[PDB]
Amino acid sequence: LSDEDFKAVFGMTRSAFANLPLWLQQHLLKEKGLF
């Protein structure tokens, strides 16, 4: 995903996502149907 596409899917930057606890990162990936 591009940075802009990442922000559109997750509503946050890549760097913001990396600051989330792993459990929430994984929650969001499943929720959005990605990686």
CATH number for position 13: 1.10.950.10
Residue 3's identity, in one-letter code, is D
Closest CA to 28 of 9, 1, 15, 13: 9
Resolution of this entry, Å: 1.0
Alpha carbons 21 and 8: distance in angstroms, whole number: 20
Q: Are 14 and 3 in contact (CB under 8 A)?
A: yes
- Nearest 5°: the CA angle 17, 21, 26 is 70
Alpha carbons 13 and 34: distance in angstroms, whole number: 16
Q: Kindly list the distances between the CA atom of residue 2 and the CA atoms of 5, 6, 12, 30, 31, in Å, as whole numbers in the listed order.
A: 5, 6, 13, 19, 19
Q: Residue 13, Cα to own-chain centre: how many angstroms? A: 8
**Experimental method for this entry?**
X-ray
Q: How many domains does the chain have?
A: 1
- List, in order, residues 6 or more apart from 29 with CB less than 8 Å away: 35
Q: Kindly list the distances between the CA atom of residue 5 and the CA atoms of 2, 12, 21, 23, in Å, as whole numbers in the listed order.
A: 5, 10, 22, 22
11 is in which domain, residue-wise? 3-32
